[PDB]
Amino acid sequence: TLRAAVFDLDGVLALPAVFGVLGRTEEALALPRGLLNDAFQKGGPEGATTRLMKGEITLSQWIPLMEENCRKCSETAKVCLPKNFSIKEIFDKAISARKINRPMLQAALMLRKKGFTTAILTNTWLDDRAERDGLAQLMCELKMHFDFLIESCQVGMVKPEPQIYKFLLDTLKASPSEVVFLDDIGANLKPARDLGMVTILVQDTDTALKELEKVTGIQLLNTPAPLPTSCNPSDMSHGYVTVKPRVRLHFVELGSGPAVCLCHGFPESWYSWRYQIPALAQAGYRVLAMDMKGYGESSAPPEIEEYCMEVLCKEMVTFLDKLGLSQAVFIGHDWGGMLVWYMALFYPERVRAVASLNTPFIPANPNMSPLESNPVFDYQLYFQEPGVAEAELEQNLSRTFKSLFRASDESVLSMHKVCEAGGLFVNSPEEPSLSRMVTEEEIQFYVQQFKKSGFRGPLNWYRNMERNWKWACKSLGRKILIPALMVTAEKDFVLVPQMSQHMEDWIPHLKRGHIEDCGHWTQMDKPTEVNQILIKWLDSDAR
């Protein structure tokens, strides 16, 4: 019974294969067939390429040795190498042309999700070219999806030497009959075969996956669309900044490039951006996913006024200052979306670009205090009285999140007549069913985050209605002229798309996004669509 899957890099997990490009260059340069591939392999176990693959020498020290092998090979074939012949150029272009074989990575991901141990076993070199970052970027995106990465240059052993296969077996803690080994080179497949491993000679990906599906019994081809990569909380870099005595802000950080500040809603976590964090990082951004004040590992002072928009915004500015960031792109959802419009309104200098998921920008009415409103969205009135909603929401944490985190068609909670009913969960079951959006594990992460501070801090965000209105009134003569994106979600019955209709009177250059069949919990409801809209907008409006 198979329990481990081993994949090669070149010609398996990454396409096109550099070996195939040597053949491509020889036909373009009208060189004799095999000349370059033969120069590459000259002296076999005793040759220059074996030394490079064993980590004895670096790529740059190898270029001159390959040049000599090429010259010698061309002399015995009685041909001439062209005038501009350069192994450096040939290999630079080859390495750069090589991209991830997405369907092969997808199948490796599927096998691992089904409890398989996965590994990359590759004959590779120590890359010291000025262009090495290209390969380092490829290796990083690939390695994260596997249990092990075995590189010849790191272990001092090469395929097809038997020791590397015995090394692989020991690393996997598996018997040979328990392993599927996938390779594009017949020769490197034979020693795995001799030990008794299942072997797949990869030419075209489809046939290779048909063989892999047949032998594993797991559907690898024609599967439904997978979810984007998520976050394992213990694998993240956790950051902490003291913004004022007694108030410290927690964040998760991933990637390099322009800074992207992710601001969650009520009653959420940095973890609500789990499907965005890896995608935006891979897209070339330095993601900072916040635990907003009152939540998770961030401070939760008890006082109501500590959660007014003015204070939260000033603290976000201090957060940038202490991290030494002149600007960040501010992306918010729900209450985070509200903060985000205010950051753009009050601190346009510190906001590269601003994006809101669901939460529209509506200017304060200077003639009417918002406290005056009305049982249509009465959860607001219910959230006002300190202690009441804290008691209901903290009673059973697991029930709170299973009742709240529900998709469009999953019998969502009523937001009307909640004061009359005397609670949010008064017509909800004691043991709600688990939503298709979340696992029991993800629900339990939220449960643990809420055990520290509870719901006072989070609810205090609803308790500064008049204070926020007074401050919002100071911005009545301003417009938002920095890059802005408004993302509406069709089936959000609290933050309705229609509520956003007039935003263009105040944000003339506003760009829009729209998600059909999407409820309130946008990030987890439609992560694939959210990531597409955000990345396209970031690459155009935020560099």
Next chain:
Amino acid sequence: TLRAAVFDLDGVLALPAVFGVLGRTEEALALPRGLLNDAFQKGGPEGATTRLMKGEITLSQWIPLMEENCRKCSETAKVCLPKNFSIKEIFDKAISARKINRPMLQAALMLRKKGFTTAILTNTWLDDRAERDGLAQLMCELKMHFDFLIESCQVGMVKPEPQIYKFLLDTLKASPSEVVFLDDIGANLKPARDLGMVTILVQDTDTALKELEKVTGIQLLNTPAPLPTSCNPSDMSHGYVTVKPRVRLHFVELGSGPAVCLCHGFPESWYSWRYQIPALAQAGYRVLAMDMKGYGESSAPPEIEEYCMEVLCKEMVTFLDKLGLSQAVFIGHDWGGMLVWYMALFYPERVRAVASLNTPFIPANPNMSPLESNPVFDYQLYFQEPGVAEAELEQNLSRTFKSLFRASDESVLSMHKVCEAGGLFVNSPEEPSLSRMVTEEEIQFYVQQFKKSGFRGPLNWYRNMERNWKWACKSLGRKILIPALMVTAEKDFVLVPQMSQHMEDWIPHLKRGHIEDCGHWTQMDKPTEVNQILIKWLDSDAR
């Protein structure tokens, strides 16, 4: 008795003043004298510029209003504005031309060091131009050096209205006679004067500083060279990454741009880079100052083999992977310098550029085990026996750091015949004097860091001599071909400049740095020189 100093931004803390550029543009465009400055101030308290300074409108909404004021002013003067006349261009160039007035910032820093409360009071706008990052960068570098930053657009009040001066007084918690107010505009100086504040009309910086030195009694002009900005540990962003179960790495992070990994020596801290962290961040780099394994807030497992170079290097790679960084510039000192050469040797793909302070690169001798050596640098033998050196170094933490952290001429500890003497501190006083390099406060920071794990982890770095040699021997055929810098320190009697003499046989493209009258503790001994060498090398060899 004065206890607070208040500074204006334009024409005081930042030069040239935008108002002076309006006069510059009018003489270049052959416009009537004062035309643009008069258009700028049109309608005074009721005008467009007052609205912009009160935060009623943003810069972009103001450009059209200034255009109209210019057209109206040119009509009454019976002149024509040129064909390409644009307030946008005039202001973009003006804002960008404005740089920090270094001698004025220096004096504000001096006054604050002497216990003065310092503040910036400025008439400023809400900048929403595409070019806003320039001003945001200027404001960030300036604001950090002051107790308060008061901006008209943020408080809804403007100079010369009396309320802003009363607001300033309340913010400073000071009586008027306790405050020095410095401004370049006579009109904005008069209300401070009326309240009873000491006022300085700033034209040229020298006369302004002469008046300021005379009234405060503190030498502000002709002072010796100040040290670079340091780090207040509680003002930093603290990052944590789990690299393997039970091993978590702590780091301090500051800045944006290419990633720069700072690796301290024995027995140090991230804090040893205190004078570099702000300088390299300001230079346009994302600094990550490590607490190396065994130190501070990083994990300190007890086992010796957990501190061999192979494991420390693999963990540094995992650190990059978890932060989602394909590369970092690796800068190391002492044992960190050793790690750094190995990162470049074993993982050139993950190292953008490599720099070592004091620690040379010397290839392992494959014919001789380094355990065989010799009482000349016998502190190595002394550090071998587990428990011995831990007991001496932990007995009195304050004494350990006061005895170790000493400048070239400060009667440094003997590194010879330490086994014969039976300890490092056997000929050292019980109460050492405080070195000119460190304050009692900085010594006490190290003391607190060492109370957690002690010296087992740090000493275990010296306990893998044979293991490191065996691994180093695998790299004997390689050269370092990535960008590299070797910084020698004249008076380092353990890591001697002469020890680095042959490095060019293995690092042909090696760039060098050299620090005269510098001991072992390079970063704190010569911070100004270290920062100059590092920044020049980073901007040329690391982008």
